[PDB]
Design a protein around this ligand. Structure first.
Ligand code: NAG
Lengths: 52, 49
């Protein structure tokens, strides 16, 4: 995990995978997103239009 | 060599608070009625009995 520009040994982009870690904002635990590591639960979001 | 772990479980929907069916077991209970009675010169009176 690098916090600053890093030059790797590899010469070809296809040989590396870069994953952005930016947790300033949270996301709904959508079934279409890969789960993070550890206790990723950060808070609750109310449902606005509840059945009545 | 990659692996996807899929998880799913069932929970009550939001509608369940307002749109649900109550299953009751019924046993012999009591019988009540409201009776309206008048006699002689006494006006109509009623009560639950
Ligand atoms: C009892 O009968 C009289 C008949 O005029 C009626 O006015 C009165 O409302 C009745 N009682 C009830 C509880 O309905």
């Amino acid at each position: 995990i690098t916090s600053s520009d890093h030059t790797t040994t590899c010469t070809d982009v296809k040989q590396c995978r870069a994953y952005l870690i930016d947790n300033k904002k949270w996301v709904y635990n959508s079934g279409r997103l890969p789960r993070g590591e550890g206790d990723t639960f950060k808070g609750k979001l109310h449902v606005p239009f509840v059945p009545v | 060599e990659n692996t996807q772990m899929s998880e799913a479980y069932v929970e009550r929907s939001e509608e369940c608070s307002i749109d649900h069916a109550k299953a009751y077991k019924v046993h012999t209970g009591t019988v009540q009625a409201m009776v309206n009675i008048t006699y002689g010169s006494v006006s109509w009176r009623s009560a639950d009995v």
